[PDB]
Scaffold this active site. Structure first.
Site, short mmCIF file in Angstrom:
data_model
loop_
_atom_site.label_atom_id
_atom_site.label_comp_id
_atom_site.label_asym_id
_atom_site.label_seq_id
_atom_site.Cartn_x
_atom_site.Cartn_y
_atom_site.Cartn_z
N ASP A 173 0.97 -1.20 -0.25
CA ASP A 173 0.54 -0.06 0.12
C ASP A 173 1.12 1.32 -0.22
O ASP A 173 1.75 1.61 1.20
CB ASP A 173 -1.02 -0.20 0.96
CG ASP A 173 -2.08 1.00 1.48
OD1 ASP A 173 -2.05 1.63 0.60
OD2 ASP A 173 -2.93 1.35 2.27
N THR A 174 0.73 1.42 -1.29
CA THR A 174 1.17 2.94 -1.56
C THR A 174 0.91 4.32 -0.74
O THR A 174 1.12 5.42 -1.55
CB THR A 174 2.45 3.12 -3.06
OG1 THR A 174 0.74 3.65 -3.01
CG2 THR A 174 3.05 2.35 -3.16
N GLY A 175 -0.52 4.20 -0.79
CA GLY A 175 -1.08 5.35 -0.38
C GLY A 175 -0.86 5.45 1.35
O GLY A 175 -2.06 6.27 1.28
#
EC number: 3.4.23.16
Lengths: 99, 7, 99
Positions: free
Chosen positions: A25-27
């Protein structure tokens, strides 16, 4: 690894003789694990998601092996839909978004 | 003050 | 590109002449943009994660531009603190994660 987006980017994480499936999860700013016991003194934190804020219990300097790449850092334990590897550990291991 | 992203 | 995770993955999108900023979210199932008056039919739906669920309106076949790359898809409008480009559209511009 070159990992496509047609399915959730779920990879196996080795966290001190414990294996889990976590999400890249790059968020996510941080790495949030589902309730778990880690060796160490934690301090309580509150982080947010789309739903609002959750109170989490945090552990500093903790090695994690993201599909056989080693990171060492903060890892929060809490009530998440799933395990997420955030940009904290995500940049230790040098992940990039290409397109 | 840390945010985390959807199911 | 090749975006870096030192800083969140904020980019710029075009939606009906709205030039806007977005977070490439490899951890987002869907695409949730804050409040915007799209033209059309929608159907309520629910999404959540850290925090809980929140209600959003779902629009079909909406055209979008993720940094000079067209893509058209489902897009959820609702009370989000960050417009987020989920994998649905993510998969249309050729994004991969590499390490």
């Amino acid at each position: 690894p070159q990992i496509t987006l047609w399915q959730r980017p779920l990879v196996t994480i080795r966290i001190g003789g414990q294996l889990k499936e976590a999400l890249l999860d790059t968020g996510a700013d941080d790495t949030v694990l589902e309730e778990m016991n880690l060796p160490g003194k934690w301090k309580p934190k509150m982080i947010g998601g789309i739903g609002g804020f959750i109170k989490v219990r945090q552990y500093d300097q903790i090695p994690v092996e993201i599909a056989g790449h080693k990171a060492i850092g903060t890892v929060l334990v809490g009530p998440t839909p799933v395990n997420i590897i955030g940009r904290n550990l995500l940049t230790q291991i040098g992940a990039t978004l290409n397109f | 003050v840390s945010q985390n992203x959807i199911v």
